[PDB]
Ligand binder design. Sequence first.
Ligand SMILES: O[C@@H]1[C@@H](O)[C@H](O[C@@H]2CO[C@@H](O[C@@H]3CO[C@@H](O)[C@H](O)[C@H]3O)[C@H](O)[C@H]2O)OC[C@H]1O
Ligand SMILES: O[C@@H]1[C@@H](O)[C@H](O[C@@H]2CO[C@@H](O[C@@H]3CO[C@@H](O)[C@H](O)[C@H]3O)[C@H](O)[C@H]2O)OC[C@H]1O
Ligand SMILES: [Zn+2]
Length: 185
Amino acid sequence: ASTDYWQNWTDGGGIVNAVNGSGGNYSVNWSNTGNFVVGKGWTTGSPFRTINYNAGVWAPNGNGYLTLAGWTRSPLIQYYVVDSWGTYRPTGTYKGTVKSDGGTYDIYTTTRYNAPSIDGDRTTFTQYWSVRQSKRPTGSNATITFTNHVNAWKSHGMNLGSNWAYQVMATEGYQSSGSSNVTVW
Ligand SMILES: O[C@@H]1[C@@H](O)[C@H](O[C@@H]2CO[C@@H](O[C@@H]3CO[C@@H](O)[C@H](O)[C@H]3O)[C@H](O)[C@H]2O)OC[C@H]1O
Ligand SMILES: O[C@@H]1[C@@H](O)[C@H](O[C@@H]2CO[C@@H](O[C@@H]3CO[C@@H](O)[C@H](O)[C@H]3O)[C@H](O)[C@H]2O)OC[C@H]1O
Ligand SMILES: [Zn+2]
């Protein structure tokens, strides 16, 4: 299935100029921001989906992630598969590693308290991460075989919720400027 979801959230800090391009294409140009998440993908995430993308521009200046990003409810979990980043490589409680799509990823968990989620301004949730041990080259067609992540996570006690929300290939930033241009299919 083609992408059917456009994610465009900013906490309102700085400038986040997001363009919803044709098909699965988007771009972001941002300046001195708070937190934001922009991307294209699917209204309902699947654990069996292979996400394809091509990041024609990946130019964070400061903290930004180029990442699969999604949520589940029941329970409320946010998840990431981080392929590249800027000045900050996100880490947490180390769980193990997983190999997928030509890369090796570290597996981490973190928890957020009284923080914004898909359920409100001030909620508590767990975050599951696969973070690539080195930045993935950008500019060619790339794949995230998400089932590999889901399976590794499960084997390390990290179960996703039963009610799947959005699933996008995102540009996320915090306290940064930058430019990205990504197509997703
Ligand atoms: O940032 C932009 C890039 O994302 C863009 O890359 C192209 C993205 O689409 C790719 O085409 C897909 C190939 O596989 C098929 O199954 C899909 O249906 C196609 O959408 C194409 O190969 C990439 O070149 O290039 C322009 C950049 O600005
Ligand atoms: O459409 C917008 C919604 O998607 C938005 O919902 C969520 C708001 O909180 C965001 O959560 C943060 C994501 O980035 C992480 O680093 C932080 O730890 C999270 O707090 C979430 O991604 C959004 O989907 O609400 C506003 C709507 O306009
Ligand atoms: Zn393992």
